[PDB]
Write a structure and sequence with these properties.
Chain lengths: ~200, ~140, ~90, ~80, ~70, ~90, ~20, ~120, ~120
RNA sequence: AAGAUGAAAUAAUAAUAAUAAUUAUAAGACUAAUAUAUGUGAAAAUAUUAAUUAAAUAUUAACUGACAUUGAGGGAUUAAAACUAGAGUAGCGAAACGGAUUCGAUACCCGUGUAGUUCUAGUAGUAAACUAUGAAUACAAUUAUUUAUAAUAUAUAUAUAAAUAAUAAAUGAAAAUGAAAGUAUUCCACCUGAAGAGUACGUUAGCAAUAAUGAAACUCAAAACAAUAGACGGUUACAG
């Protein structure tokens, strides 16, 4: 019947949610399913939703709340950013087990951020990679805070900050540093707490 | 013995005139706890300078204007200086929103009251509003 | 007596009308701006103007209804303008 | 709370406010005059400002919102009026 | 014929039963699926699975043989 | 140093986007910036001036429901409690 | 009056946790 | 009927401010119990500064000893208690409010009910 | 009960009147029981109005309640005359008090010295 | 000098020390914020606090078994003004007396200010007493908000009611109404060109003022409602 197909249809596969699309609080994890389109469908404003998305949207990713509203629009944001954070984490290689052997709503383990298992070495043309080096940005004078790969992490120094820190001041974020991501756990709220060290 | 804890510069800015009054709060060092606390809470006051725009020479409709209030404030500050009464801290009080209220502010914060403004510590409003109260006059059918 | 004098300052500060502020020495005009913000935030000038003359209770009621309607109209108008800005940004 | 409006003859802002960017020349001039007030006239401590002022005012001494259009364009679509 | 959760038998119609419910016959029914309750749970337990992009453009629903 | 308003502090443990390093983020934050908002009956606090002095102005004027954000019932109860407190010599 | 006296003495005289509300 | 009295007793004897409030509470409680009444609570609030310089009869006050009394009494004796309170120089302000018992026989004072303790039984556990 | 609200005393009085007029346990709706409970509340509101003679809202309520008792007793007369006569005899009213138009007007309050 | 005004002036502002300020006493009347009259009440009304008494909500359980609706006459209540007595009278303020303005002022404005406004016991029973819309019953397409319950685990953009807002249909001279100004049924009130006229006369009631009831002759081909397009406005806003 039509009802069974509707229950199995791709729109039905997206779980209902009405969280604000313009949240200004703290973001620990994704809140909205990212919707993607191919170039061929985007050329025809086709996204598998009810209504054609406006031609102004050149990006191939969006998030949305309502297919249609009393305002005769679809409530959406042309953003798919949270996928690039996840992939960047996958590039770091630092791992984070409940993935091994009435309903509980709490996040299980990592909430899908990473499925990599703990103990493995990264072979390289030099040799086994002993530690993971990643570019980052020191944020503010404070363990300092660094923007690394879409995540805010805690920076610890070998001995003390260099002169560039206080030379630049609040413009310290303009320059790129190298960090060693020591470790990465996740807390109950669902937030990843990476510990790094400046180099 | 009459100490002087502070001074109070009171302004009354009505529609047709502005009345400025400088006062000194006398205290007496010296009777139950309640009596002493009451005495300190509402300490006696004594007028020292009293001025209105008429004192400055303005007449009739000229009394309610901006310039009249401004010059009256200037004269008030000059008199506070001449009487050598800038010793203790001043507490400004403002009692109505007449057109001379802004004039008083401009004179005080400006060069006219630059001598006095260094010594004012508290500025407050004392506008009297009735919570129901007596019946106001009827509207004027102009 | 001595402890009395110790407590006079606390007791005297306690009886605050809420319409008094402490002048900032560096910029006194900033303090007067704060006081004027208090005045408008308590509608003290507006109440003083409205108490000048007597208004019949029916006229008071109709003015009250009019003002409330205008406020709610502005709120709805702002909501609609926000929707206009949102739709414009998405490209509608 | 949501306050929906009745059907309006229009949806228009009376006096739309715009982004009046401040003139760089006037800001430079104010900074230079502040410098002369503090550090003395013809002070060497802000000759750079003077230079910058001279460079910015040299040729010229001084160096619109679309909300109503989009509001008129979109009012019928978003007003939530019931169908005819 | 059996006592309700509060122990009381039902011996006469209540005020809801006596109201004509013809409107329900014409109101388009709300479609419900248990999977939707179970779709909400998964993405509450795996918020980063929402970051995996999804394509809502169907290829052909009839071609699916799973 | 720069004014703290013009800068954005990304919290700890939070994910971010490049957009967050922009004036757009600060501007969007500005635009999109308790005990009575609960099952508690405000009429039980009529003898507690400290609690219900939070829902008045510096001069003591009860705040409009547009400000307090309370439900109609709790606005009415809070106003009753404040007026009763004013009458019984508190407040 | 006996219970009144016992309560009044204990409740007031002793340095008891009052409902000072601060 | 359950009633909640909130008295503001004067404190003229600085060295023992509670002295007045104790004898006020004793008088009111004696009246209640001798008039087929019951006293459930005598919750003391502290010494507090009054919001204004309140003038009971011909003496001005700037502070008072606040106290609360929860008591079950009839309407006539409750009016009598209020009468005695209003014509007592010791008392600056007084107020008696009903606590409705249509639901629960036992009910805590307004202060404890605001804290979360709905009845005296919770307050004693 | 002497420390309680008067409405509780009226509730107990209503219970007693119902138990004295009921045709069987649980009977609360027979015309005789309705008249008895109305009578109890009429007595209470009449006392209240005697104490508050400028309370016209509750005087109106009392008037309406008296007329309601009249309507139900007139129905009882039409339905079960024997029980009707027994009921009005036990309640202190005669047939004229029930069947005659009764606006609880100022003339009534003068003739019967209500105040 | 003050006060007032558009600007001034007032037989009774101030040198008899005023006005302004700070205290202290006294008296009346009123009830800032919350606030929306949301609501409550039959309407009139009603929002500073507390108590006593009385009324008013929803849903379940049980009970009566049509006991209902409407309602001529009748009854009750009924704003403001007004009246009769007795208290009170701070503010406001008919009348009156003055000062202005004006060609003139009999007015608007200013000053003194009696009655009244306040309370107690009454009389009176009228308002644009209006939603200009009598009450009850059955029914009719939607949406959005609240509002109040009942769930189910903030989420069900949760169901069931009332109100509010915008409407479909329908109706309507249209304006518009919109769950009634729709579809129907029942009962009551009222209307039948304008003017004369809510007048006269009579009667009833009332201390009075008055209230109710309520004509006719004479004259005319008028008179009114909604909407349309202008003109005009000591009408608004925007531009140039
Ligand atoms: Mg009947
Ligand atoms: Mg109010
Ligand atoms: Mg009827
Ligand atoms: Mg009125
Ligand atoms: Mg009168
Ligand atoms: Mg008289
Ligand atoms: Mg008078
Ligand atoms: Mg006057
Ligand atoms: Mg004229
Ligand atoms: Mg006059
Ligand atoms: Mg009468
Ligand atoms: Mg008449
Ligand atoms: Mg009439
Ligand atoms: Mg018609
Ligand atoms: Mg007549």
């Amino acid at each position: 019947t039509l009802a069974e197909l509707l229950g199995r249809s791709r729109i039905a596969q997206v779980a209902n949610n009405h969280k604000p699309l313009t949240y200004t609080g703290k973001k620990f994890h994704p809140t909205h399913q990212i919707i993607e389109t191919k170039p061929s469908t985007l050329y025809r404003q086709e996204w598998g939703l009810k209504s054609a998305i406006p031609s102004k949207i050149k990006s191939r990713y969006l998030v949305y709340n309502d297919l249609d509203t009393l305002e005769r629009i679809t409530t959406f944001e042309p953003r798919g950013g949270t996928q690039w954070n996840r992939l960047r984490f996958q590039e770091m290689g630092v791992p984070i087990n409940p993935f091994f052997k009435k309903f509980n709503t709490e996040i299980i383990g990592t909430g899908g951020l990473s499925y990599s298992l703990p103990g493995k070495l990264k072979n390289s043309p030099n040799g086994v990679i002993q530690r993971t080096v990643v570019p980052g940005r020191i944020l503010n004078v404070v363990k300092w805070l660094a923007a690394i790969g879409g995540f805010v992490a805690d920076v610890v120094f070998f001995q003390s900050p260099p002169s560039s820190f206080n030379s630049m001041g609040d413009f310290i974020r303009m320059k790129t540093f190298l960090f060693e991501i020591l470790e990465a756990s996740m807390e109950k709220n669902g937030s990843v707490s990476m510990h790094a060290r400046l180099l | 013995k009459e100490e002087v804890v502070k001074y109070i510069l009171h302004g009354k800015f009505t529609k047709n005139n502005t009345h400025l009054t400088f006062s000194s709060v006398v205290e007496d060092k010296n009777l139950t706890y309640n009596d002493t606390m009451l005495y300190y809470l509402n300490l006696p006051q004594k007028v020292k300078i009293s001025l209105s725009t008429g004192c400055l020479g303005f007449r009739k409709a000229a009394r309610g204007e901006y310039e009249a209030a401004f010059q009256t404030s200037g004269r008030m500050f000059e008199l506070i200086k001449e009487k050598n009464m800038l010793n203790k801290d001043i507490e400004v009080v403002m009692d109505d929103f007449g057109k001379g209220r802004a004039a008083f502010i401009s004179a005080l914060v400006g060069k006219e009251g630059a001598s006095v403004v260094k010594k004012v510590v508290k500025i407050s409003d004392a506008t009297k509003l009735k919570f129901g109260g007596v019946r106001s006059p009827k509207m004027r059918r102009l | 007596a001595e402890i009395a004098r110790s407590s006079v300052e606390n007791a005297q500060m306690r009886f605050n009308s809420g319409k008094s502020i402490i002048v900032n020495k560096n910029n006194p005009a900033e303090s007067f701006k704060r006081l004027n913000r208090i005045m408008f935030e308590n509608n003290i000038p507006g109440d003083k103007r409205s108490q000048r003359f007597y208004m019949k209770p029916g006229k008071v009621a109709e003015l009250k209804r009019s003002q409330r309607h205008r406020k709610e109209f502005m709120m709805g108008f702002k909501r609609l303008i926000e929707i206009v800005k949102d739709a414009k940004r998405k490209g509608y | 709370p949501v306050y929906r409006l009745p059907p309006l003859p229009r949806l228009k802002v009376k006096k739309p406010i715009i982004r009046q960017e401040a003139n760089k020349c006037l800001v430079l001039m104010s900074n230079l005059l502040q410098c002369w007030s503090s550090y003395g006239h013809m002070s060497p401590k802000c000759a750079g400002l003077v230079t910058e002022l001279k460079s910015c005012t040299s040729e010229s001494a001084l160096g619109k919102s679309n909300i109503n259009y989009h509001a008129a364009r979109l009012y019928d679509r978003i007003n939530g009026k019931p169908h005819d | 014929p059996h006592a309700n959760n509060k122990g009381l038998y039902k011996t006469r119609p209540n005020s809801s039963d006596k109201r004509v419910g013809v409107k329900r016959l014409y109101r388009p029914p709300k479609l419900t699926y248990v999977e939707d309750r179970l779709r909400s749970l998964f993405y509450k337990q795996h918020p980063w699975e929402l970051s995996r992009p999804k394509i809502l453009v169907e290829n052909e629903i009839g071609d699916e043989n799973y | 140093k720069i004014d703290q308003s013009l800068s954005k502090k990304l919290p700890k443990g939070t994910i971010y986007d490049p957009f967050d390093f922009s004036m757009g983020r600060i501007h969007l934050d500005r635009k999109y910036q308790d005990i009575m908002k609960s099952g508690a009956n405000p009429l039980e606090f009529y003898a507690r001036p400290r609690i219900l002095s939070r829902y008045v102005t510096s001069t003591g004027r009860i705040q409009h429901r547009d400000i307090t954000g309370l439900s109609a019932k709790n606005q009415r109860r809070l106003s009753k409690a404040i007026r009763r407190c004013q009458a019984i010599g508190l407040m | 009056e006996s219970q009144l006296l016992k309560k009044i003495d204990k409740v007031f005289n002793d340095e008891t946790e009052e409902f000072t509300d601060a | 009927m359950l009633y909640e009295l909130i008295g503001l007793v004067r404190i003229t004897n600085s060295n023992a401010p509670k002295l007045e409030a104790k004898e006020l509470s004793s008088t009111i409680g004696k009246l209640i119990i001798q008039n087929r009444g019951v006293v459930r609570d005598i919750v003391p609030m502290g010494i507090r500064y009054l919001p204004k310089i309140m003038k009971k009869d011909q003496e001005k006050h700037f502070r008072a000893y606040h106290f609360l009394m929860l008591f079950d009494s009839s309407a006539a004796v409750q009016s009598e208690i209020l009468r005695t309170l209003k014509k007592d120089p010791r008392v600056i302000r007084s107020s008696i409010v009903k606590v409705d018992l249509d639901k629960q026989l036992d009910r805590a004072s307004s202060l404890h009910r605001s804290l979360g303790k709905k009845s005296i039984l919770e307050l004693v556990n | 009960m002497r420390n309680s609200e008067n409405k509780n005393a009226i509730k107990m009085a209503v219970e007693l009147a119902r138990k004295e007029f009921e045709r069987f346990p649980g009977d609360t709706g027979s015309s005789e029981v309705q008249a008895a409970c109305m009578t109890v509340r009429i007595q209470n509101m009449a006392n209240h109005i005697k104490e508050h003679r400028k309370d016209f809202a509750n005087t109106r309520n009392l008037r309406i309640l008296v007329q309601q008792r009249q309507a139900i007793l007139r129905y009882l007369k039409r339905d079960n005359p024997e029980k009707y006569y027994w009921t009005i005899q036990k309640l202190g009213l005669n047939d004229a008090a029930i069947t005659d138009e009764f606006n609880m007007d100022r003339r009534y309050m003068q003739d019967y010295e209500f105040f």
